[PDB]
Design a protein around this ligand. Structure first.
Ligand code: MG
Ligand code: MG
Ligand code: MG
Ligand code: MG
Ligand code: MG
Ligand code: MG
Ligand code: MG
Ligand code: MG
Ligand code: MG
Ligand code: MG
Ligand code: MG
Ligand code: MG
Ligand code: MG
Ligand code: MG
Ligand code: MG
Ligand code: MG
Ligand code: MG
Ligand code: MG
Ligand code: MG
Ligand code: MG
Ligand code: MG
Ligand code: MG
Ligand code: MG
Ligand code: MG
Ligand code: MG
Ligand code: MG
Ligand code: MG
Ligand code: MG
Ligand code: MG
Ligand code: MG
Ligand code: MG
Ligand code: MG
Ligand code: MG
Ligand code: MG
Ligand code: MG
Ligand code: MG
Ligand code: MG
Ligand code: MG
Ligand code: MG
Ligand code: MG
Ligand code: MG
Lengths: 77, 149
RNA sequence: UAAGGUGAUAUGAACCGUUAUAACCGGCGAUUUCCGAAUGGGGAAACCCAGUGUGUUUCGACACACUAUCAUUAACUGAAUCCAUAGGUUAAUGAGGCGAACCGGGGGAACUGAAACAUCUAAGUACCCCGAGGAAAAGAAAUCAACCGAGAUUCCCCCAG
RNA sequence: AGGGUGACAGCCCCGUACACAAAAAUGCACAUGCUGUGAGCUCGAUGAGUAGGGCGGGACACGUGGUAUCCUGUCUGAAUA
RNA sequence: UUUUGUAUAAUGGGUCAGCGACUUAUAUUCUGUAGCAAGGUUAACCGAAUAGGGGAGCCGAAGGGAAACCGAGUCUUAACUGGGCGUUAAGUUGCAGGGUAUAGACCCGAAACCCGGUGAUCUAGCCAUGGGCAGGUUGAAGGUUGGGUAACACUAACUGGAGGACCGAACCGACUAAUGUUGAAAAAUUAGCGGAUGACUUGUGGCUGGGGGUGAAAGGCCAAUCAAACCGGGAGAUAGCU
RNA sequence: GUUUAUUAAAAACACAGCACUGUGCAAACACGAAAGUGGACGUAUACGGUGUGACGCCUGCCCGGUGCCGGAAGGUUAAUU
RNA sequence: UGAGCCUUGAUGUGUAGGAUAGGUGGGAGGCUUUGAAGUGUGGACGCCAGUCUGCAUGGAGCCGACCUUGAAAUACCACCCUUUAAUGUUUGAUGUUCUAACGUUGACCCGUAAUCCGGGUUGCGGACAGUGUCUGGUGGGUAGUUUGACUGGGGCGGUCU
RNA sequence: GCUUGACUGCGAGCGUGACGGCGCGAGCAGGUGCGAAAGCAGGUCAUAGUGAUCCGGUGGUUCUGAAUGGAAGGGCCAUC
């Protein structure tokens, strides 16, 4: 599913509004990308489906700290 | 992204320095190779430990280089046995162990290696310059007056 | 507890019992076919077909037990690839499905009303889905107030159509 | 109270008020015991891709309106008593 | 009943019996009636439970002004001879009732819109696997021979057995006519008619699902239902109409 | 040959043939929020779409409009800043 | 190939003049042997007067109160304003090249006696492509709807204050 | 010829309209013009020459100003 393993960003629903304010149901999808992340703690590439923000979160927290939060959430990576 | 370097990098820096790198370069290249590691509030002391475990164990030695090289002006009067003939010039030679065991009398540590003798072997009964290898850069001083014997 | 009893249509038959194992009532127990989450594999539900391990046999064949999946943990093992890791086998623990309403969450109509209609309305209603519990959610101020002070959340009546 | 009994029963019957009762199992309360969880003091510490912002949406009675406040899909991004 | 007007040949009713339509809740106003009265009354809740307590509140006793503000006056205007609204009138809470409002709102009744399901045992198309086509005809290519060219070209005979080929049964279909039209039958029967080795037909099973399918295309067919199926739900949709 | 099962079998549909156009393969295109699947275990003598509709003689003038293709100095022009 | 900017090297012709006076202070001479001053001349700038610069050999000298002059010497120091050359350097466009993201419905290896999947090795592309958010355009492909009344029936026409 | 009464605030009372509204209006206050003065003048001989509300805009006005001082916005007056 279109969910980020770091953040848990999933598609959220909303409305498209026109100039006449005609509302129509629509989805907001995250900016999900599969990216291989270097885990130097383990000498291994780990592949995560992640949002661009989760990519920012990994840079900040470090993939080592992040993955410890994932295996503390199930979330087999 | 601010990161430090574990090696020299072409158009960036040298052997450890905080510089600002695009996230993709650091993330997709610099960190997967061993060319860098970010500042994470730890590597400003942890890989900055090769510059702080360094200084935690390099700091106090900068002073030893002096006290290991100061008390050699105390005597300035040493004379060592060796053969010596006419004209004031010598018969034999002067190695380094000649002066290494000579001034063990003077107490504080002295060696044959951490003394250095010139390429000439002091074949004179006359002042010919010598120095001590106390510190590698700072030169310490040697002059012995070989006993004209 | 008892002189009456063997459920009903429902009579009859053959019997039990009457001073305490008749029946009846209650508690703990026992048995509890097959299907069905159905779980050994399959399948047109109540059927078909096994495997392993024991113990039995007159050597024709019998009886019982275990054998799903997933998750977790563990042990053993184990690639490409030296390490390792994936992967494999087993054990143990737990889950699975059903169920009225209430609850929380994820999605989300239109008729209709506007005396047409699109904003708006209907309505976060109906409906679908996930999950839980005896209730759930919420909850101990980064709240209100107005220079006086109140002192978490929830529900009721007012404030007020 | 009621329900029955050959028509309408306080006294025919079953019952009702009232009084009593459990081998066995069990509930909710109490007391008490084994096992595990930690108070009390003292000094420290005070939740960052977060708050906030831009874009698009939603929620707040409040339809973006002069619109605070909450949530966030996207891009960003502090101070830290 | 509906109408200007109905014996009307305008509507409805075969008959009887039974059922079948102005309700309920909350707000609001007017009337009546009762209580108290410049005061009336409590709500939730407490409970000494239809008591009593609870006066938080609501209405009323003052209005004018957009408002600050003023106040039996106020606003207006620089100010009124003035003018507008007001002062000179008891209300309030119950009970009953008449209206209004929100709710299905007097009852019955649409076509339809939307949500979620059920359906390809009919039919349409496709997929796989099996089957069926009596009998009779025509006689393509090719082949062979004779004939003919320097050799190819070539022409009778035999052979051969092609074809969305011919006639015609089973089988598949349905052009005409009659019958029947509360039928034997919610599409048939009778006589004739078309195809009948193919783009054929048929059995078994399978796939496609509703704004979707499938369609040699008729808006045809998708279980006697199709310009959006069926069932259930929204739902007592709405109905200025009958 | 096909068709309005149940009032229309036809001049309608289809048809071989013709042309135009798209498509270089992870093809276009289509079903699918997606994965994927068909196309096709095919590869431009192929595939999809459109129109015409055996065969024969042929298919004339018009690119102003609308689309399609291409071109690009200038003008107009969104988010953003 | 566009621009800011630590910081320095160039930019300062009312004219008096020895001839190219932003300015206050710090001060009386700064540089010249990690080379003075004299020559050719480098590509700059210029009021047509020379300012400063690259280099050759060079080897003991150009530079004030100078008298004048509203101003006293680029003699040194120093913050600083008109001007204008460069790069460590910030982000802009284009072009080329790369690889490490990303892709691969290429080959090969293992998982695995598996045309899925994953991992691995390799090649090919490669910051493209592709996807998210935002945005302009297109958009009966699909949806929701509108498309008036009077009227000697309706429609056409005419009319609507 | 002179001028700005095509004035500002009000308005007894009438008229005409279902209403919204439209119209006529002496006289009062203030200020003006014409005229020696009486007086006339609140547009044009009259009756057509127009468009509700909403949403906004502009100017004025310290009416209001969500702790408070301001401001925003709102109100009120004039006009689009
Ligand atoms: Mg079984
Ligand atoms: Mg099974
Ligand atoms: Mg609607
Ligand atoms: Mg309507
Ligand atoms: Mg709406
Ligand atoms: Mg926002
Ligand atoms: Mg009539
Ligand atoms: Mg009539
Ligand atoms: Mg009559
Ligand atoms: Mg009659
Ligand atoms: Mg009639
Ligand atoms: Mg009649
Ligand atoms: Mg009748
Ligand atoms: Mg639906
Ligand atoms: Mg549905
Ligand atoms: Mg058929
Ligand atoms: Mg035939
Ligand atoms: Mg025939
Ligand atoms: Mg048959
Ligand atoms: Mg027959
Ligand atoms: Mg027939
Ligand atoms: Mg035939
Ligand atoms: Mg038609
Ligand atoms: Mg049918
Ligand atoms: Mg339902
Ligand atoms: Mg109805
Ligand atoms: Mg409804
Ligand atoms: Mg035919
Ligand atoms: Mg027909
Ligand atoms: Mg017919
Ligand atoms: Mg045609
Ligand atoms: Mg034709
Ligand atoms: Mg173009
Ligand atoms: Mg349409
Ligand atoms: Mg509608
Ligand atoms: Mg009409
Ligand atoms: Mg006057
Ligand atoms: Mg006139
Ligand atoms: Mg204002
Ligand atoms: Mg405030
Ligand atoms: Mg304030």
């Amino acid at each position: 599913s279109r969910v980020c393993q770091v953040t848990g960003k999933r598609p959220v629903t909303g409305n498209n509004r026109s100039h006449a304010l005609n509302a129509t149901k629509r989805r907001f999808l995250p900016n999900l990308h599969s990216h291989r992340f270097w885990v130097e703690s383990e000498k291994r590439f780990v592949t995560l489906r992640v949002s661009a923000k989760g990519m920012r979160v990994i840079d900040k927290k470090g993939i080592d700290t992040v993955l410890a939060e994932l295996r503390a959430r199930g979330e087999k990576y | 992204m601010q990161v430090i370097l574990l090696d020299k990098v072409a158009n960036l820096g040298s052997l450890g320095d905080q510089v600002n790198v695009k996230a993709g370069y650091a993330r997709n290249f610099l960190v997967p190779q061993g060319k860098a590691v970010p500042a994470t509030k730890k590597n400003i002391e942890f890989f900055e430990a090769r510059r702080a475990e360094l200084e935690a164990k390099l700091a106090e030695v900068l002073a030893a280089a002096n006290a290991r090289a100061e008390k050699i002006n105390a005597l300035e009067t040493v004379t060592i046995a060796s053969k010596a003939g006419d004209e004031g010039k010598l018969f034999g030679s002067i190695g380094t162990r000649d002066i290494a065991d000579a001034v063990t009398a003077a107490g504080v540590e002295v060696a044959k290696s951490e003394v250095r003798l010139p390429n000439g072997v002091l074949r004179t009964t006359g002042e010919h310059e010598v120095s001590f290898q106390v510190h590698s850069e700072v030169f310490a001083k040697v002059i012995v007056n070989v006993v004209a014997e």
